[PDB]
Design a protein around this ligand. Sequence first.
Ligand SMILES: CC1=C(/C=C/C(C)=C/C=C/C(C)=C/C(=O)O)C(C)(C)CCC1
Length: 137
Amino acid sequence: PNFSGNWKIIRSENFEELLKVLGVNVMLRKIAVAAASKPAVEIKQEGDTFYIKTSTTVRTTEINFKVGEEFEEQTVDGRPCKSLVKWESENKMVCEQKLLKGEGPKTSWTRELTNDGELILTMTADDVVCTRVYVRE
Ligand SMILES: CC1=C(/C=C/C(C)=C/C=C/C(C)=C/C(=O)O)C(C)(C)CCC1
């Protein structure tokens, strides 16, 4: 699979609900939800090596990882974590996250390329799942 490209969002479900489970307060949620509705996403893939940049007016994240090798990033609400990505299937990667310090909901994320050429991102916090769908610009 080739995840490479500049992606634009076409659907977002359950984002605020995910933030609620993570403990983000009402006003911060309001800010986050508005900014997250129009992200600029850039993915560069070279084999099993990935670079993913997600940008919004209030927060930009850039992660670099190799599938199967542990790395450090942050949860959606901004807490440091150790992550490990694996191929669940040929077109789907799954990432398990572990908080470096403290306790909180168990979080994870998955990215998959669908048969129609789109990209589905899921983010999980305990039992709440956020689903976002993108298409290349
Ligand atoms: C949670 C949160 C914040 C914003 C988060 C944003 C904006 C997340 C965007 C995620 C995207 C854009 C994911 C994707 O689509 O891959 C701010 C900075 C207000 C601080 C309080 C907690």
